Design a protein around this ligand. Structure first.
Ligand SMILES: *[C@@H]1O[C@H](CO)[C@@H](O)[C@H](O)[C@H]1NC(C)=O
Ligand SMILES: *[C@@H]1O[C@H](CO)[C@@H](O)[C@H](O)[C@H]1NC(C)=O
Ligand SMILES: *[C@@H]1O[C@H](CO)[C@@H](O)[C@H](O)[C@H]1NC(C)=O
Ligand SMILES: *[C@@H]1O[C@H](CO)[C@@H](O)[C@H](O)[C@H]1NC(C)=O
Ligand SMILES: *[C@@H]1O[C@H](CO)[C@@H](O)[C@H](O)[C@H]1NC(C)=O
Ligand SMILES: *[C@@H]1O[C@H](CO)[C@@H](O)[C@H](O)[C@H]1NC(C)=O
Ligand SMILES: *[C@@H]1O[C@H](CO)[C@@H](O)[C@H](O)[C@H]1NC(C)=O
Lengths: 161, 314, 39, 175, 49, 48
């Protein structure tokens, strides 16, 4: 549990868990690459405890547009759903307020790790974005396809100067 | 593309210090502009990947009977017998490149590795079963020994030079593909140009962590001792040097990241152009798609980049 | 959650998107000296 | 510093220690100004790259016809038209898109009179029992003759060669 | 290409004075970053040529 | 005309003009966007 700990000094904040590091008898506390106290020997019982910082992360608000609706979804980035209606777990984080829908649509609002969100039209849904429509070509070693007509396309390209 | 980084400004500059957070609000739009810059960089990385790989419209598939006139594409076509449906060469590429710490977090990319692999597979299937026709309209399908004839016409060599040497030509191609993998296995630093950015990013981030230990001329780099052993008149002034120093280091990091992202954007624009001319067509541009008279090209995915296999006539 | 986004962007309207509004942060909660020989 | 307005600093405090406050404010504002100019240099480099691209697109799309595959719009480039915009340019790319494709049977060569024939330009296509030379990207079938076909070898080395008649244009009128 | 420049931190920021150098070590890894950036620029110039 | 003004310690330099904005009776200053002092009332004769 997130506690304010003090072990012969070493004042800090975090959660203390049992560890398996092999401290030499003269060593009191450990330090990670980047110099962050990662472990500590408690003076009383001489046990080795790992220190893990309390859960933190960013909060993103997925909005379908104020003019459309006032519903929102909340994404907690890099946070497990084991901590703080619908709750869904993604490689991006914990998504609350969005019902996962297992039909693939084009990406409307990028959540991450291949998962997007959109206003169902009614509620905000989360889905796995689709790359496109499968079209196997009829490959054969003696068949060709030749176009019998054409169209003329006028594309528009904007370039800042 | 780069890694999509993010920084919680408070926790880097303050940490567990409440007084530091109270003081930091005086500066205002510093953390806002740093967050906007990093968000722009991340969105730009996703855009880079999207522009390079998502050129194809439909997701094409290759026929079950994989006979293409004697040309063997097994080393570039995906292998279903693996959890990741990547090709034999792409697997070597991912194996050869080896890839919540106090406010510095890394955002996952929007496109997963399997999605980029599926895009690459669609490009390969379209190139093999349609030629260059799938990038300029409807994907019209032609026999592969007849794409090669068209491309020989493209480099200024008559059609029959293919048909009279087809088997020989096929074998040459096959052998080259084989040697390619050995080359990728031989020189460890062959993909160094693709590892460097990774290394570079780590270096920058490492420096940032190191900058959290510097005193910046103060009595110590730990906020707790400064707040405990000192009176407010000097403590708050001592902290001001630790906030100014940390803000300067963070701004330096953001500026360096902006320059690096500009470089990566230039590289991604070049990669998209290579995908357009080299892969979706045949390039008369002299040295753009490999040494020798360009015949065709094949894309392969890599952890933060693209590998082009340029088949050329010498 | 929406209001806070509105407050951050300094606008009463939010267009469709993912907007980063705040940070979530779980919270925290002998050799005795010989006085006996003298006294 | 004590305040962001110089009047309070200069009024309430004498110059000796007000100098430190003024120096702090000046350093902060110089830092912000330098940050602004550095950001502007980066953005100007980005805009310069965009303007170089737009100049290349004017040169190769508007003053010519481009063979680069997706440079001057999607499709086979026909032409392009520039339009002014507030801080940029808009290109209208007119391109040619094939449509209404049909299936046919092909053969890389035609074995006639014991020798192989390859098409000068176009492909051999068939609709059943009939063979035609057509252009590559528009269906326009023509009868196979020697004016559109080139002989090159005997027809026992090409894999997939079919055998069909190749009309001789000089045969009927001269005989 | 452009000119390849190398910079010595101590002789610029501090000069001959022995005492200030003694103060300079407390700022950390600024000069490592600076020298690494300049070496990267120089190697880039050679690669351009 | 460009003139130094010192309104009870509010020191500044500028051109003072007949104001056309409606300060409510509890307002003694005027700010534009980005906190620029756009209008002021005289603490003596109460003129905007
Ligand atoms: C809704 O309002 C937004 C601005 O809040 C505007 O951009 C959009 O065009 C509006 N759409 C409709 C359908 O009114
Ligand atoms: C997240 O929480 C779940 C509990 O449902 C657990 O199984 C999983 O291992 C946790 N993730 C990590 C990375 O520990
Ligand atoms: C929808 O697909 C998901 C994929 O994970 C699956 O878990 C779920 O059971 C499916 N639901 C229905 C109703 O098919
Ligand atoms: C293609 O090459 C691989 C590797 O040498 C080989 O194992 C495979 O048999 C070849 N494929 C065919 C269809 O012959
Ligand atoms: C061409 O043949 C394939 C396979 O027989 C078929 O799927 C496709 O629709 C055909 N196209 C036309 C235009 O008939
Ligand atoms: C093939 O086309 C030719 C000319 O268009 C026509 O005379 C012939 O009848 C056609 N044959 C078939 C089987 O459609
Ligand atoms: C096409 O391939 C099949 C099987 O791969 C083969 O039987 C047939 O002879 C081939 N045809 C040509 C024209 O190569």
């Amino acid at each position: 549990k997130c506690v304010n700990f003090n072990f012969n000094g070493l004042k800090g904040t975090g959660v203390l868990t049992e560890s398996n590091k092999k401290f030499l008898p003269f060593q009191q506390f450990g330090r990670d690459i980047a110099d962050t106290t990662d472990a500590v020997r408690d003076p009383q019982t001489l046990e080795i405890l790992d220190i893990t910082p309390c859960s933190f992360g960013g909060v993103s608000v997925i909005t379908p547009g104020t003019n459309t609706s006032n519903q929102v979804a909340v994404l907690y980035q890099g946070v497990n759903c084991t901590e703080v209606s619908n709750v869904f777990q993604t490689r991006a984080g914990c998504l609350i307020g969005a019902e996962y829908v297992n039909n693939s649509y084009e990406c409307d609002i990028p959540i991450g790790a291949g998962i997007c969100a959109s206003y169902q039209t009614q509620s905000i849904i989360a889905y796995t974005m689709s790359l496109g429509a499968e079209n196997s070509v009829a490959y054969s070693n003696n068949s060709i396809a030749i176009p019998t007509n054409f169209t003329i396309s006028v594309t528009t390209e904007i370039l800042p100067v | 593309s780069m890694t999509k980084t993010s920084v919680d400004c408070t926790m880097y500059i303050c940490g567990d210090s409440t007084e530091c957070s109270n003081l930091l609000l005086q500066y205002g739009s510093f953390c806002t502009q740093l967050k906007r810059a990093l968000t722009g960089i991340a969105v730009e990385q996703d855009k880079n990947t999207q522009e390079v790989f998502a050129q194809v419209k439909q997701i094409y598939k290759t026929p079950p009977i994989k006979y293409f006139g004697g040309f063997n594409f097994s080393q570039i076509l995906p292998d279903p017998s693996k959890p990741s449906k990547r090709s034999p060469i792409e697997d070597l590429l991912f194996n050869k490149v080896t890839l919540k710490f106090k406010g510095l977090t890394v955002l996952p990319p929007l496109l997963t590795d399997e999605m980029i692999a599926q895009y690459t597979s669609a490009l390969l299937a379209g190139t093999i079963t349609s030629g260059w026709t799938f990038g300029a309209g409807p994907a019209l399908q032609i026999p592969f020994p007849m794409q090669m004839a068209y491309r020989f016409n493209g480099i200024g060599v008559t059609q029959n030079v293919l048909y009279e040497n087809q088997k020989l030509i096929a074998n040459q191609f096959n052998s080259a593909i084989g040697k390619i993998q050995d080359s990728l296995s031989s020189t460890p630093s062959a993909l160094g140009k693709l590892q460097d950015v990774v290394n570079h990013n780590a270096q920058a981030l490492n420096t940032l962590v190191k900058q959290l230990s510097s005193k910046f001329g103060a009595i110590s780099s730990v906020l707790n001792d400064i707040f405990s052993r000192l009176d407010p008149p000097e403590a708050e002034v001592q902290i001001d040097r630790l906030i100014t120093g940390r803000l300067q280091s963070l701004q330096t990091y953001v500026t360096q990241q902006l320059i690096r992202a500009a470089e990566i954007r230039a590289s991604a624009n070049l990669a998209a152009t290579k995908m357009s001319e080299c892969v979706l067509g045949q390039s008369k541009r002299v040295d753009f798609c490999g040494k020798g008279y360009h015949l065709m090209s094949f894309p392969q995915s890599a952890p933060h980049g693209v590998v082009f296999l340029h088949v050329t006539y010498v | 959650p929406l209001s806070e986004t509105k407050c951050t962007l300094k606008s009463f309207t939010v267009e469709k998107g993912i907007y980063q509004t705040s940070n979530f942060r779980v919270q925290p909660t002998t050799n005795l000296c010989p006085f006996d020989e003298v006294f | 510093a004590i305040s962001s307005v110089l009047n309070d600093i200069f009024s309430r405090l004498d110059p000796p220690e007000a100098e430190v406050q003024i120096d702090r404010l000046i350093t902060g504002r110089l830092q912000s100004l330098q940050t602004y100019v550095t950001q502007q240099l980066i953005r100007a480099a980005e805009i310069r790259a965009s303007a170089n691209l737009a100049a290349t697109k004017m040169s190769e799309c508007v003053l010519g016809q481009s063979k680069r595959v997706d440079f001057c719009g999607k499709g086979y480039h026909l032409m392009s038209f520039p339009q002014s915009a507030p801080h940029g340019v808009v290109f209208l790319h007119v391109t040619y898109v094939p449509a209404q494709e049909k299936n046919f049977t092909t053969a890389p060569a035609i074995c006639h009179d014991g020798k192989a024939h390859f098409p000068r330009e176009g492909v051999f296509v068939s609709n059943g029992t009939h063979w035609f030379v057509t252009q590559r990207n528009f269906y326009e079938p023509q009868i196979i003759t020697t004016d559109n076909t080139f002989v090159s070898g005997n027809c026992d080395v090409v894999i997939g060669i079919v055998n069909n008649t190749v009309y001789d244009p000089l045969q009927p009128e001269l005989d």
